[PDB]
C-alpha cells in the first residue's frame, strides 16, 4: 500500500540507519567510503557514499553516527545510531517530559533525547548547513533506528525552517514527546517525517501512553515478519495521532522484531 519508489527510499534510509552502528563508521576521516560488514548496507556502498563528518560520543548521553555525502542519489544524509552504550541505555530512562517551546509552543519532549540533541545542535547544524551551501541541489535527510530515530525526529523538528527542507525517516523509534509535539510533528512544513514501524516491535510503544506520551501521524506499518524480506504491499499507512491499527496495540510486544527493518538493523559491529 506503498509505491515502489517510497519502498525503495524506506530500504535506503533503513540501510543508512543500519550503517550508523558499525563502529568503523563513527570514527572515519572525512572523504572516505562508507562501508558495512555483514551486507548491512549494499545500497549505501553502491551509491559511492563518503563521510562529511563521522562522530562518536558527542554531547550528552553519547551521540554517535555520521553525516554523509551521496552523489549518486544527491543526498546529505545525517544518521544517528541507536542504543549501544551504558550511557545510551541510561539516557532512555530520563523519561520526564521537558518543555521545548523553542521547538514548539506548548510541546514537551523526552528529557534525555531533547537533551542529547540540544547537546550537539549547533555543531551538527553548522555541518549540515556547510554541505547544503556547497551542494544546494542535494536533499537533506535525517534518519536513525531506535533511539537514533528519536534523535533524528527531534533534530528535524528543530532545524526545519532554516531555509532547506529536511526529510526524516525513523525505524522502530520510541515515542518522543506529548500530544502537542506529536501534533506539531504531523503538520509541520519543510520536510516530511516518515515514521516506520515493524509488526509488534516493542520500542515504538515506549514510553507508554500511561506516561503522557503520544505518536505523530502518520505511521508506516510493515506487517511482514522478522527475517522475511519486505515488499511494497507489506507496508500500510496508518493515519491518526495515537492510532491503534498499527504497532500501538494492546497485545504482547516483541523484541527481535526491532532488529528487522527490511534487513538486520542494530547488529552491525
Swiss-Prot record:
CDD domains for this protein: Lipase_3 (cd00519)
Q: How does activity depend on pH?
A: Active at alkaline pHs (up to pH 12 approximately).
- EC number of this enzyme: 3.1.1.3
Q: What class of enzyme is it?
A: hydrolase
The record's disulfide annotation reads 22-268, 36-41, 104-107
Q: Which Gene3D superfamilies match?
A: alpha/beta hydrolase
Question: One GO BP annotation here?
Answer: lipid catabolic process
According to its UniProt entry, this protein's organism is: Thermomyces lanuginosus
Keywords, comma-separated and alphabetical: Cleavage on pair of basic residues, Disulfide bond, Hydrolase, Lipid degradation, Lipid metabolism, Signal, Zymogen
Q: How is it used?
A: Used as a detergent lipase. Sold under the name Lipolase by Novozymes. Engineered variants are sold under the names Lipolase Ultra and LipoPrime.
Gene Ontology MF annotations: triacylglycerol lipase activity
Q: What SUPFAM superfamilies does the entry give?
A: alpha/beta-Hydrolases
Protein name as catalogued? Lipase
Thermoactivity: Active over a broad temperature range.
| Residues the record marks as active site | 146, 201, 258
